[PDB]
Amino acid sequence: EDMAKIYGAVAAVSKNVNSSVTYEVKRGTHELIKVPTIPHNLVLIQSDNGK
Amino acid sequence: GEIIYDGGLSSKLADVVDKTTEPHNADGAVKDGRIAPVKLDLEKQKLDKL
């Protein structure tokens, strides 16, 4: 029974090793909006007689 | 006549998951005794907890 206690304690230490890590790479990334219409700024001004 | 061979149960070499899977260690015929991969929250676009 004492040996079973000792062996189990050593096994727990051996299981404390770390396998790897995982993370998400997202810094520097932004979302894009979509502009539907082209912003023209032209207006036509004409005289009443059409001259 | 009597049917000797008409198809039957067919073995498949491998199964292919159609869903995205989180990282994991071996848990089949080989079991990994090490800790599962640690998931860290990094590369936060906006500041938090600092």
A27 touches chain B (CB under 8 A): yes
Which one of B34, B46, B47 would you mutate to disrupt binding with A, by most A Cβ within 10 Å of its Cβ?
A: B34
Question: What one-character DSSP code corresponds to residue A2?
Answer: H
A47 touches chain B (CB under 8 A): no
Here the tokens at position A4 are 């079973």
Specify the resolution in Å. 2.6
A27/B38 CB distance under 8 A = no
Question: By what method was this entry solved?
Answer: cryo-EM
- The closest of A24, A15, A27, A29 to B39, measured between CA atoms, is A24
Instruction: Report the alpha-carbon distance of residue B47 to residue B50 in Å, rounded.
Output: 7
Backbone angles phi, psi at A6, to 5 degrees: -70, -45
